Design an enzyme around this catalytic site. Structure first.
Site, PDB file in Angstrom:
ATOM      1  N   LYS A  43       0.815  -1.220   0.000  1.00 45.14           N
ATOM      2  CA  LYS A  43       0.000   0.000   0.000  1.00 45.14           C
ATOM      3  C   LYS A  43       0.845   1.264   0.000  1.00 45.14           C
ATOM      4  O   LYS A  43       0.404   2.313   0.491  1.00 45.14           O
ATOM      5  CB  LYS A  43      -1.011  -0.002   1.171  1.00 45.14           C
ATOM      6  CG  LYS A  43      -1.655  -1.361   1.427  1.00 45.14           C
ATOM      7  CD  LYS A  43      -2.234  -1.981   0.149  1.00 45.14           C
ATOM      8  CE  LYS A  43      -3.342  -1.103  -0.456  1.00 45.14           C
ATOM      9  NZ  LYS A  43      -3.727  -1.596  -1.818  1.00 45.14           N
ATOM     10  N   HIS A 102       6.210  -7.098  -3.141  1.00 42.78           N
ATOM     11  CA  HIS A 102       6.196  -6.535  -1.777  1.00 42.78           C
ATOM     12  C   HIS A 102       7.205  -7.213  -0.847  1.00 42.78           C
ATOM     13  O   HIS A 102       7.260  -6.928   0.350  1.00 42.78           O
ATOM     14  CB  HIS A 102       4.792  -6.607  -1.163  1.00 42.78           C
ATOM     15  CG  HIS A 102       3.772  -5.805  -1.894  1.00 42.78           C
ATOM     16  ND1 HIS A 102       3.954  -4.479  -2.213  1.00 42.78           N
ATOM     17  CD2 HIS A 102       2.553  -6.144  -2.375  1.00 42.78           C
ATOM     18  CE1 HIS A 102       2.891  -4.032  -2.859  1.00 42.78           C
ATOM     19  NE2 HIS A 102       2.019  -5.019  -2.955  1.00 42.78           N
ATOM     20  N   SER A 132      -4.248   2.652   4.836  1.00 42.73           N
ATOM     21  CA  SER A 132      -4.471   2.099   3.500  1.00 42.73           C
ATOM     22  C   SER A 132      -4.599   0.571   3.546  1.00 42.73           C
ATOM     23  O   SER A 132      -5.466  -0.006   2.882  1.00 42.73           O
ATOM     24  CB  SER A 132      -3.322   2.502   2.562  1.00 42.73           C
ATOM     25  OG  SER A 132      -3.572   2.065   1.221  1.00 42.73           O
TER      26      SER A 132
HETATM   27  N1  LIG Z   1      -2.201   7.750  -9.207  1.00 39.99           N
HETATM   28  C1  LIG Z   1      -2.111   7.648  -7.864  1.00 39.99           C
HETATM   29  N2  LIG Z   1      -1.760   8.695  -7.067  1.00 39.99           N
HETATM   30  C2  LIG Z   1      -1.674   8.610  -5.713  1.00 39.99           C
HETATM   31  N3  LIG Z   1      -1.931   7.470  -5.037  1.00 39.99           N
HETATM   32  C3  LIG Z   1      -2.318   6.355  -5.738  1.00 39.99           C
HETATM   33  C4  LIG Z   1      -2.418   6.360  -7.207  1.00 39.99           C
HETATM   34  N4  LIG Z   1      -2.823   5.126  -7.617  1.00 39.99           N
HETATM   35  C5  LIG Z   1      -2.930   4.383  -6.498  1.00 39.99           C
HETATM   36  N5  LIG Z   1      -2.636   5.114  -5.395  1.00 39.99           N
HETATM   37  C6  LIG Z   1      -2.680   4.676  -3.980  1.00 39.99           C
HETATM   38  O1  LIG Z   1      -1.690   3.694  -3.659  1.00 39.99           O
HETATM   39  C7  LIG Z   1      -2.210   2.913  -2.575  1.00 39.99           C
HETATM   40  C8  LIG Z   1      -2.257   1.462  -3.036  1.00 39.99           C
HETATM   41  O2  LIG Z   1      -0.911   1.079  -3.206  1.00 39.99           O
HETATM   42  P1  LIG Z   1      -0.465  -0.278  -3.862  1.00 39.99           P
HETATM   43  O3  LIG Z   1      -0.694  -0.129  -5.389  1.00 39.99           O
HETATM   44  O4  LIG Z   1       0.956  -0.398  -3.440  1.00 39.99           O
HETATM   45  O5  LIG Z   1      -1.392  -1.320  -3.215  1.00 39.99           O
HETATM   46  C9  LIG Z   1      -3.624   3.383  -2.304  1.00 39.99           C
HETATM   47  O6  LIG Z   1      -3.643   4.370  -1.266  1.00 39.99           O
HETATM   48  P2  LIG Z   1      -4.942   4.791  -0.357  1.00 39.99           P
HETATM   49  O7  LIG Z   1      -5.489   3.443   0.066  1.00 39.99           O
HETATM   50  O8  LIG Z   1      -4.353   5.705   0.666  1.00 39.99           O
HETATM   51  O9  LIG Z   1      -5.939   5.544  -1.232  1.00 39.99           O
HETATM   52  C10 LIG Z   1      -3.985   3.962  -3.674  1.00 39.99           C
HETATM   53  O10 LIG Z   1      -5.167   4.783  -3.671  1.00 39.99           O
HETATM   54  O1  LIG Z   2      -5.295 -11.729  -9.267  1.00 38.38           O
HETATM   55  C1  LIG Z   2      -4.732 -11.018  -8.248  1.00 38.38           C
HETATM   56  C2  LIG Z   2      -3.731 -10.091  -8.532  1.00 38.38           C
HETATM   57  C3  LIG Z   2      -3.152  -9.376  -7.485  1.00 38.38           C
HETATM   58  C4  LIG Z   2      -3.576  -9.552  -6.159  1.00 38.38           C
HETATM   59  C5  LIG Z   2      -2.898  -8.767  -5.083  1.00 38.38           C
HETATM   60  C6  LIG Z   2      -2.893  -9.191  -3.808  1.00 38.38           C
HETATM   61  C7  LIG Z   2      -2.179  -8.533  -2.667  1.00 38.38           C
HETATM   62  C8  LIG Z   2      -1.898  -9.320  -1.537  1.00 38.38           C
HETATM   63  C9  LIG Z   2      -1.211  -8.791  -0.447  1.00 38.38           C
HETATM   64  O2  LIG Z   2      -0.933  -9.531   0.655  1.00 38.38           O
HETATM   65  C10 LIG Z   2      -0.798  -7.467  -0.461  1.00 38.38           C
HETATM   66  C11 LIG Z   2      -1.060  -6.676  -1.570  1.00 38.38           C
HETATM   67  O3  LIG Z   2      -0.640  -5.386  -1.515  1.00 38.38           O
HETATM   68  C12 LIG Z   2      -1.743  -7.194  -2.685  1.00 38.38           C
HETATM   69  C13 LIG Z   2      -4.567 -10.501  -5.882  1.00 38.38           C
HETATM   70  C14 LIG Z   2      -5.145 -11.224  -6.930  1.00 38.38           C
END
Ligand SMILES: Nc1ncnc2c1ncn2[C@@H]1O[C@H](COP(=O)(O)O)[C@@H](OP(=O)(O)O)[C@H]1O
Ligand SMILES: Oc1ccc(/C=C/c2cc(O)cc(O)c2)cc1
Length: 289
Positions: A43, A102, A132
């Site tokens: 996140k 990750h 998040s």
């Molecule tokens: N274009 C963008 N600008 C800023 N934040 C973004 C983004 N696209 C995704 N995110 C944010 O990145 C986080 C998800 O991260 P990841 O892709 O690593 O899972 C989320 O934060 P929030 O849950 O605070 O909104 C998501 O909304």
């Molecule tokens: O088809 C799929 C493609 C991507 C995902 C991502 C899962 C995921 C799991 C975690 O523990 C952390 C995370 O940040 C993301 C799940 C299903």
């Protein structure tokens, strides 16, 4: 079966139940020298920077960036689910491949170090990450039920969440900076000045893009545009896997959103733990812009 199951340990780290099986497949992954790794604690802006890099590698060509959903263009290395696994998709992708992960530095497939692959490690302040990640677990049915926000924060602070402690993840990756080609970036800097941050990525990848292209990348990768882009906003996943009615994946996209959920008492306790973990390191995160 895999849904809403408890985390499993993988070499000492708690892991999403579905991803923890047949881990040897991940360990033996064969990278290529021109693979570009995007590594983050969960996140921290992986999807955001994935789309940035895809635009960069495709010289800002939007139609190119529309060739597939994000899970095909930039697969998650450790993902397995019957969806094709991240590794199977990576094996199908042309070079230069972008690889999202990750994983703690100690769990990254050794090939990546051996091949000298370039890596972009993106980090985000631990308060916004906690919030998040809590909301992510509400929607992502592969995860354990997070419980109430107060129970979840305690688990986040002790590292009893998938991929382990934010503290350890960030600090261990930071130690790898001097020894390997890694660009260290911060979500807060990207939110505050995407032009300069994106420029840092372009130089790291040894690319040359004009200011018209740069503005188009900034526009195309802004939260407002990405949230409504069905190729990158994770609405393409089965309803069973991610139910966006509980929390959208593109949730807020803000630095400082944590303030809306942390109580003052939670904040003071967090800060004390944070200080103990982080005071000796030379990382200074911002919790607001
Ligand atoms: N274009 C963008 N600008 C800023 N934040 C973004 C983004 N696209 C995704 N995110 C944010 O990145 C986080 C998800 O991260 P990841 O892709 O690593 O899972 C989320 O934060 P929030 O849950 O605070 O909104 C998501 O909304
Ligand atoms: O088809 C799929 C493609 C991507 C995902 C991502 C899962 C995921 C799991 C975690 O523990 C952390 C995370 O940040 C993301 C799940 C299903």
């Amino acid at each position: 079966d895999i849904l809403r199951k408890d985390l499993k340990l993988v070499h000492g780290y708690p892991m999403t139940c579905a991803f923890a099986s047949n881990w040897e497949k991940i360990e033996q992954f064969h990278s290529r020298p021109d693979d570009i790794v995007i590594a983050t604690y969960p996140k921290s802006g992986t999807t955001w920077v994935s789309e940035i890099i895809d635009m960069i590698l495709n010289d800002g060509d939007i139609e190119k960036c529309k060739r597939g959903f994000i899970t095909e263009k930039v697969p998650m290395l450790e993902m397995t689910l019957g969806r094709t696994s991240g590794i199977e998709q990576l094996e199908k992708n042309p070079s230069p491949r972008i690889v999202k992960t990750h994983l703690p530095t100690d769990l990254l497939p050794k090939s990546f170090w051996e091949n000298n692959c370039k890596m972009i490690y993106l980090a985000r302040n631990a308060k916004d990450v906690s919030v998040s990640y809590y909301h992510f677990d509400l929607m992502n049915n592969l995860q354990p039920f997070p419980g109430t926000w107060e129970e979840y924060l305690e688990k986040f602070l002790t590292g009893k969440v998938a991929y382990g402690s934010w503290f350890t993840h960030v600090k261990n990756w930071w130690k790898k900076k001097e020894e390997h080609p890694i660009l260290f970036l911060y979500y807060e800097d990207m939110k505050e000045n995407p032009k300069e941050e994106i420029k840092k990525i372009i130089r790291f990848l040894e690319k040359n893009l004009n200011d018209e292209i740069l503005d188009r990348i900034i526009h195309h990768t802004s939260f407002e545009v990405m949230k409504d882009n069905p190729l990158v906003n994770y609405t393409h996943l089965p309803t069973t896997v991610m139910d966006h009615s509980k929390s959208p994946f593109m949730r807020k996209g803000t630095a400082g959103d944590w303030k809306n959920y942390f109580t003052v008492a939670q904040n003071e306790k967090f800060d004390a733990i944070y200080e103990t973990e982080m005071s000796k390191t030379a990382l200074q995160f911002r919790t607001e812009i």
